[PDB]
Symmetry: D2
Subunit: 212 residues, 4 copies
């Protein structure tokens, strides 16, 4: 056991669940959040039967108050050392069929939410003097294809937040990273663990993984 927490913002999918499993398996108390937090009960049982610690919460990440409360709670339980922001929103609409609602919603889910998760984690971590903030990217963080104006906009948006944060906070002992996924959920979790284990002398900001 470590006297430390890991926040997994977006433990709904298999990737998010695997990240939770992995950091729990390594002795962190995992705070896991998804929209319908009752659906985390399978994951909790499995992790706790394996002897690991997890606090499951319902969380709409679009809501900045809930994100702040989620992260503050994690840090109150034990010092927050790692946040993994894992909130996707893969949608495709031709530009004319991209509504105001969809564009705003995707930004709120995939960019706005990551900004708030990143800022509030930084606030908690800088008080401890160390920490790691990891964001999940996609190929839409790198290039905007046809139909992906809403989605690529939010993912480019998140990438820029990660960059600016890294420029500011890497010199302040916070490892900001951006993992672009393009597999086993478990392989994504292993990749986050690999970023976690990097020493200060050789930190990677951006990594892309593909399955072969």
């Amino acid at each position: 056991p470590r006297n430390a927490t890991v926040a997994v913002i977006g433990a709904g999918d298999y990737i998010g669940a695997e990240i939770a499993k992995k950091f729990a398996a390594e002795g962190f108390t995992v705070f896991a959040g998804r929209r319908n937090g009752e659906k985390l009960a399978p994951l909790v049982a499995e992790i706790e039967a394996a002897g690991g610690r997890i606090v499951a919460r319902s969380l709409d990440a679009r809501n900045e108050d809930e994100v702040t409360a989620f992260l503050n709670a994690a840090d109150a339980h034990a010092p927050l050392e790692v946040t993994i922001f894992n909130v996707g929103a893969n949608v495709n609409f031709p530009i004319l069929e991209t509504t105001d609602r969809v564009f705003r919603k995707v930004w709120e889910m995939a960019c706005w939410a990551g900004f708030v998760s990143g800022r509030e984690s930084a606030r908690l971590m800088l008080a401890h003097g160390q920490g790691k903030i990891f964001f999940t990217g996609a190929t839409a963080s790198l290039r905007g294809g046809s139909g992906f104006a809403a989605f690529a906009s939010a993912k480019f948006g998140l990438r820029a937040v990660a960059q600016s944060m890294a420029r500011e906070l890497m010199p302040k002992n916070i490892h900001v990273a951006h993992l672009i996924i393009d597999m086993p959920p478990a392989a994504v979790a292993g990749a986050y663990w690999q970023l976690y284990q990097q020493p200060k002398s050789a930190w990677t900001f951006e990594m892309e993984i593909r399955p072969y």
Copy 2:
């Protein structure tokens, strides 16, 4: 001459004025747009003095209904052939001092507004079967520096919108372009004219200019 309109969304600054001057000098009826639309009066004087046609309007680009009406007003006067989105927003705040309001407001001015201006320009131009949609970018569209989380996030976001639109609409005879600036505000207006003059067999999506 000409029987067609140019919408210059962001005619408030020096760059926006010069673009309005340039496209009017080349025979287009320029629909200029800024916040305080009555501050366009010295520009409207100078342009009409030289024989150019200009319709000055108040415009808050964040408001999607105002943008839609602005672009519809331009098209109703003469077929809309060129939209140039040129909306500022250059701010710097450390991550912890980047407020909810700043982040959301910067996105609204610089990314959301660009998406609306773009999608609505596309609707109108596709009726005429041709047209050009140009977006002004910055170094912050390409990399996020320290303190630039809000601004870089929004410019990255605009880049992805421009990219996705280009992937879909360039095959449908609409030249979508993204002009990155690091000048003569007049030199920027010239660069846009270069992009306008390009034939369909040699269209550039992204062009970056800087002085020496």
Copy 3:
């Protein structure tokens, strides 16, 4: 009215190169046009001269640094060298195990080495006049290396770096170094190079990508 100036077109043997020569000659420059077999430039010379333009055709193997240097020195001696356009392609594809020592070396000599020498020697000549433009033709293989493209992409990436490094050094010294990436009509590429030529120093583009739709 003739400009008292030359343009070196290194690689005037394809349609793109010929159109570049046609364009700069149409705008009043004397074009020095080089291809491996200079006698094959005879139709181009005839066409340019009948339209009122000036052109000197030479045989030039751009892998040969002595020939590149002599070609550029000759152009500058004629009239001040103002624009060099390096347009030496080489699109070839071989799986990695089938990419021979010969193919890899030759593609580098033609597409990268030749560009370095042309660039360096053009810079030497142009800096004496205090101005000039040095343009390099790139490809998508300048930006990413696909399967089978190890030799070609290596040389194109290599050319792009040379261009970047020359630009960082010489743009503040009044040389517009540029890199035009293509993937037409050939007349369109010439237009794009003319567009780059026309840019004022308050707004130069280093790299630009074009494609047809």
Copy 4:
């Protein structure tokens, strides 16, 4: 042991030495090459006192015959499983001062040698049905600065070789990677160990590391 060899081409610097020490400690038989192979004698003595296995050879990486013989020698000892190509050439000259001799020598040491190293490694590895081919890059692999025409040309060139080889060979079970440096040399060795440990479902092609 691992009953396998690791070829370190460019073991004459501190980084090269550390890569050798690292893979030897993990039970590989390291084949270490540098221009004067007698200067590897201290490293051999250090690794072998620790219980590691290493063979030192003189190698001029510009010479394709020597590179091929080096890698054949490695594979003849035990299956070549990892090749790490690590031959730098960090020189700076203004363009007019970059001689024919310098531009060619730099390509020969830093690009040509890498190509031959990669092609020959792939030949040997494909016969065993697996392998990893790693290339050390620099910031000059990504952008060319003033004075770096020779170095950046060769480094860009090598990046491209790595890219093409990766596209072709990752589907055929060879992990090709490009580690961009910029720091302790042990940190570089650690990052290559990271890349070695990546499972097939989550391989990264390119990773940048820098110190903080």
